[PDB]
Design a binder for this molecule. Sequence first.
Ligand code: HEC
Ligand code: HEC
Ligand SMILES: COC1=C(OC)C(=O)C(C/C=C(\C)CC/C=C(/C)CC/C=C(\C)CC/C=C(\C)CCC=C(C)C)=C(C)C1=O
Ligand SMILES: COC1=C(OC)C(=O)C(C/C=C(\C)CC/C=C(\C)CC/C=C(\C)CC/C=C(/C)CCC=C(C)C)=C(C)C1=O
Ligand SMILES: [Zn+2]
Lengths: 376, 464, 59, 48, 441, 194
Amino acid sequence: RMHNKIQLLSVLNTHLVAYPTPMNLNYSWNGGSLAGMMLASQMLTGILLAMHYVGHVDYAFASVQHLMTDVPSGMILRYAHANGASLFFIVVYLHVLRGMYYGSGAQPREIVWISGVVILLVMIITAFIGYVLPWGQMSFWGATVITSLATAIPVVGKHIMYWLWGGFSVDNPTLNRFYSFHYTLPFILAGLSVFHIAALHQYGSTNPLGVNSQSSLISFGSYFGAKDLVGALFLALVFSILVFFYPDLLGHPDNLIPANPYSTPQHIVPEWYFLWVYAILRSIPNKAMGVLAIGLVFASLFAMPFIGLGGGKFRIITEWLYWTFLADVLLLTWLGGNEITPITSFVGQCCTAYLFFYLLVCQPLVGYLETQFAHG
Amino acid sequence: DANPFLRFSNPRPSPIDHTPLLSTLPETRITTLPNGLRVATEAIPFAETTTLGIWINSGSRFETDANNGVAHFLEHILFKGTKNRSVKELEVEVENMGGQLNAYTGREQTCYYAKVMGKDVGKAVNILSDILLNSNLDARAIDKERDVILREMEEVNKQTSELVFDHLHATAFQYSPLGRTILGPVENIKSINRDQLVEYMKTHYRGPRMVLAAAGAVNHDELVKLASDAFGSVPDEDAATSVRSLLVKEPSRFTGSYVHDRFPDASECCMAVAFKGASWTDPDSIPLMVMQTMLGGWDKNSTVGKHSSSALVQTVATEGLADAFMAFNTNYHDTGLFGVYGVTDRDRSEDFAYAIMSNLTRMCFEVRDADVARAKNQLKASLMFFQDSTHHVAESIGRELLVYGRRIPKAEMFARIDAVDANAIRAVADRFIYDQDMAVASAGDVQFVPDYNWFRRRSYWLRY
Amino acid sequence: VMRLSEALYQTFFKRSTVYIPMLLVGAYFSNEAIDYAVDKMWTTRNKGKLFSDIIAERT
Amino acid sequence: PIGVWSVFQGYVTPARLPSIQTLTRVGAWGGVVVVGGLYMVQPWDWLA
Amino acid sequence: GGGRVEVPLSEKLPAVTEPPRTSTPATKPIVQTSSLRSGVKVASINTVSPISSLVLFVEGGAAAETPATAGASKVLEVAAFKATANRSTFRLTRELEKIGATSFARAGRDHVAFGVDATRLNQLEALEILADAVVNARYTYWEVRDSLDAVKEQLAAQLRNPLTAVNEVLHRTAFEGGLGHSLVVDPSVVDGFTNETLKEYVHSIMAPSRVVLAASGVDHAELTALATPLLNLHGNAHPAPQSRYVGGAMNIIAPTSSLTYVGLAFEAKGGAGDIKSSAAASVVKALLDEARPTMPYQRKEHEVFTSVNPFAFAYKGTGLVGVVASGAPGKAGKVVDALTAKVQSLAKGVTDVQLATAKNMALGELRASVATAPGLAAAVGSSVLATGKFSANEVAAALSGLTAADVTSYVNAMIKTAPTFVTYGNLSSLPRVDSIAKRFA
Amino acid sequence: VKEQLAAQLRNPLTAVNEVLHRTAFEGGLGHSLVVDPSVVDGFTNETLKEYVHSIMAPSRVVLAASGVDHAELTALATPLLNLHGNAHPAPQSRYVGGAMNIIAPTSSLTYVGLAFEAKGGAGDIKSSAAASVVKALLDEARPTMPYQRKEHEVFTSVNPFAFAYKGTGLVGVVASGAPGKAGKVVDALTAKVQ
Ligand code: HEC
Ligand code: HEC
Ligand SMILES: COC1=C(OC)C(=O)C(C/C=C(\C)CC/C=C(/C)CC/C=C(\C)CC/C=C(\C)CCC=C(C)C)=C(C)C1=O
Ligand SMILES: COC1=C(OC)C(=O)C(C/C=C(\C)CC/C=C(\C)CC/C=C(\C)CC/C=C(/C)CCC=C(C)C)=C(C)C1=O
Ligand SMILES: [Zn+2]
């Protein structure tokens, strides 16, 4: 064989052409290839964007405007890079919810789940510090509110805060270092994605039935190339609609105002994909307790392969509870864009309590009850 | 739960008191002749057979470079005719007493013994003294045995385990008398003669180095009279040429080293790893016995290896790392050897080596009490099994008088075993194993055996 | 020939959790000695040319 | 089935748990990270 | 710190002789036998040894096998002492290894034996473990399936020795019936074996009147009182295919046998039941011992032979005394001629010194077989199963009271009976079979 | 070579033929042809060269042909077959007979072979013709039609043979049967020749 004589062709053949895949995978197994396509699109658009962006105060806003109106195809590149972050987060969130529904992180795929959670954290940091770069009002004030939350760790507070800022407030050193960190972090994302895919290939994927599928495996490169192409074309349709018809629908109008450190906007909210964490933080009336709850959510995400029992269908109680969890998370996403009100504070506290209750009580105990019902 | 089939027995290891077994064990009587020869008997009350022989505190250690191999050649020559009996006369007289003569020659011990019936004690004494004192040592028989030994040397006719252990003694005891083989080199066999045999027997086979040990059906006074008649003419020993003076003059030395004997088309891969152990007189030799029981041994004809108490046996049997292995505890007059020998192939040699090293170093840190109680019970039961055969009773009498200087009673041995606990095991393992040099020997298909630095690195843990 | 002592081995070398803090205090003192030697040599060689020499001269 | 499934099935006994000596040897790593942090930062005579 | 008193020095005041010396029994202990109310016979002999041996003898072996259950005794040797109704395999292994006891399963040509050897302080544990592993054994599917491989290499290794193969073919040729079946079968015989085959074989061989409990160094009243609720057995006696001696001759073709093996055998009349005939057969076996290795490194040279190995088996009702001799491939007819000459010279008379030497050799073998506790327990169990009593004193008296005229008469009556003749090896030189069995006629 | 030998010894007829040729003869005719595969273990090309050198001599070689002119064949084989060698002595063979048995522990059929010497060998035309006729007579079950259903009471399969060598030969019959029916197979094979 021609692929048996060059080691590059052997690896590519083994992992992209002849890789045995279950034949009954539905269209909810296309999240990963879509996420990889969105990562590649973001990298390409950003590398093109960085040839016209200047990472300095008193030039950043004007460089973005010169990019928008004077660079040929520059408006397409900027709007694509802005809405691609939203579509990247949509796809990755649906991927995580698929894994939550089917119990995809269980033995022997715990490394796949853990590397996914690490990828999600790096994605969040990348998107935040990239949102600071246009240097509008929302960029400056979100960077101010989030980075001045290290004053919750006792003693070693404002020292870390002033070392992050490079000064005493968010200013030109903060923007200048945020440009370098934001350029650099997506390559770590690409390497972690390669490691994440390589960890899955050790044992292969789960199937919608939740049973062993070693008897019914087919080649990846013929059957799941066109199936991924169909979903990629749907994603390209949504992407083209967002770029060309509603380019500022998902944004905030305040980020089109140049940043003013002496005047604050009426409502300071982040992008939509950060809103559930913001609601968890804003609901608790203590800064250190809010940061502790935010850390506890991700700790419970890491602990999910070792505490979570229960998968998709034929485990029907946890299957029904998944929809309450999805409603809870979407409610937290809605609450983050509202104002602080006693009823919204009470509802956000109840939603955070139920999120912890589902992640830490329902998944082990109800799953154990389901195993005792089914095979006991 | 079955009422009659589930009482009395349970898998929880608990210490057993072996004190009531001491009430009926027989006593050893020792009589020292004016020659310096000790006569020691142990009468079993209703025995019909008798093992008796002569144990000598000599062997391959006390030779020189010029006559290395004389003591092993002596057991080829000694049974080929004496000055009072011919070959056929000896054969007929041994056949008529219904027993067999036998001989072993170690690095430090030699025995010649007879397993006869109780009516043939005096005849066996007379025959043993006749070969020991009045041998022909004919040059024709020497030439008739030299060529056979040279053929089996040219063919490399040897056991694999003996080959590995001889390499291990040669590399662990470099430039000391214990590094020589019992067989000797080819040149000494090619130039052996009657004079060297006479000089070796005249120098080393003397009164204070010889024990006449008999077990089974034997009277002590009659054996004293027979030994004074027969073995009364052995020379005494000079004070300047005693065993202790020779031990002081040429002491043992341990060197951390590595050897492998590679063959181009072999199938097996035999290997042994040993640490510098304890001498016979070290009080740490009893915990080393308990630790050797804790490591145990296993061969693949057994099918209950996965339910073993020993963790090393469990690991090797479950993962299939070796076809057979055994832990050994060798004791000498002034040094010793402690380690594990095993047989594997070239694809499982590194994992077997890792299992050996990881289980040896683990005894310094974590030792549970159940394993120690189990090993103490197994070692005491093994000591009681040797009391069942009169051959082992006579062998233990001879060995204990040669190397301890006295007959250790069974109550003292049980008390010394029962004083071992988990802290003692951890202390002895810390003394002998942790961050120490080891000796590595292998033979066969040994291209994938790790080198010395790999073995040296795994004698300690960086995580504690 | 020359050989590390057994009693000094059993204290500072057998465990890594005792070896590492000893390593850190030795590292601290080694850095202090190297700093002292370099600074003393530099100040002795360039005496009368530094700014502090002019300032102490003007007192 | 690594984690809470091991303790639901009864696979975590008083045996197969680490000993007190094992926990002390692991627990001795607490001083190493403290000394390493104090070596890295050097807040000399900062203890109140 | 631990103990630091060196072993040349006596241990200190914490080393007491608190157990006193128990007085010896007045006489040598005798064998005491009885029968349980279930029908199992129990025989025991007291010893002064600190080791108690318990063995369970069941009639069976290769003589109770069928073509369907072929090679079941060899599988039962490996599959014994595993998971029972009350204990798992892990629990039984740990309970044996806790008290330092050892277990064996050993299959003969007319019996299977199961035994546990332990110290005198753990005799109840050994008895309970042995009874539970024999009576309540489960013989699970997966354990037998995994043991079949090790059975195959053990049989393949045991068939590497040509004397085992010659013994198998000799027993096939000498007998028709139960004793002619093969014990050490080919490895491919047990290729289709399952646990149902072993369970069928065990159900055939097990019956209360075919089971004997033998013990060494155990009080008899205590043993019967504590084994009555444990050995309450039920079952039917499967019919036994009684064997008869007919004689004959056969051959074996071996492609890479560097030597050539010749077997000659006769029938010992009366079997193990007759004390005098078995004693005379043992004396004949010792008289055929040409090269006995009584000394280290002794080189007895024969003109033609390379090895001589006689035997004397004593089954129930019939026996097989004979000799197997090796030799060069080109000298096989000389091996046959020398063997016939040796048996004929034995028939011509034994001369005093040879008779005394063979009697001493037989007495030494008989007394060295029962020297240890497991050997004594095995001897008691086999003798009670074959006859109903243990008669080692009577066997010794028969060996000592044998005259040369009786031995000459015994060999004269032997050579009149038709013999059994078996060859082995890449046979490229052989006298014709009609003249082979003519020299004794 | 070893796998072909193992394939050939799987047929019990080949093994019975080998044992018959060894048992009936003393000399070169009793040597085994289809040897065990373990025999060819320590075999090299020097062993083959030694065997070829032992068998090669210009008086031991016959060039036969079919469908060619004889004069042209001799004219063209003149400069090719210039063989030089020493005529090694022939280990001549004599019939002795006897009885031997070969054990197969997992064979579902027991084979019985019977044979007699064809005196004269291939040189005697009349004796060879009589041996051929006796081989044809002993062939009880020769299927001459498709799906013939001949049924013997004891003979599972019957194969007669007739061999002709230089100076001697064999003619006889090999009959199989059930393992429990071998004595009746011997009885019928014996009674057939009277
Ligand atoms: C927090 C969890 C998580 C995150 C975030 C995540 N993954 Fe996944 N991913 C998984 C799990 C679990 C699986 C295995 C699903 C299965 O086989 O049931 C998986 C499977 C995949 C697959 C195989 C096809 C598929 O969709 O099942 C790909 C490709 C993939 N991931 C890529 C990515 C990429 C690219 C990213 C981000 C840029 C990403 N994943 C983010 C957990 C995650
Ligand atoms: C996970 C999300 C994500 C990834 C991956 C990402 N970016 Fe962006 N980046 C953003 C967001 C969001 C913005 C804010 C865009 C806006 O609102 O105008 C941004 C802004 C920028 C800007 C400022 C110009 C502008 O129009 O805002 C540059 C330059 C840039 N990114 C470059 C890159 C580069 C270079 C890469 C990869 C090598 C990259 N990005 C990958 C999310 C991302
Ligand atoms: C309106 O306001 C707000 C924003 O603003 C628009 C936000 O976004 C968010 C969302 C942010 C969240 C939830 C936290 C983001 C996570 C972290 C860890 C903070 C980011 C940390 C930084 C910048 C420290 C410096 C580190 C850098 C630059 C990279 C480090 C390098 C590596 C890891 C290799 C919220 C809630 C918000 O209310
Ligand atoms: C459950 O079954 C499975 C699936 O579900 C059906 C999958 O989907 C996948 C994975 C799908 C893959 C790998 C294809 C999707 C694409 C990805 C991750 C990357 C996107 C890249 C694109 C479009 C082109 C990038 C181009 C260039 C030039 C960048 C490279 C740079 C250089 C050469 C310098 C796998 C393994 C799988 O098992
Ligand atoms: Zn030797």
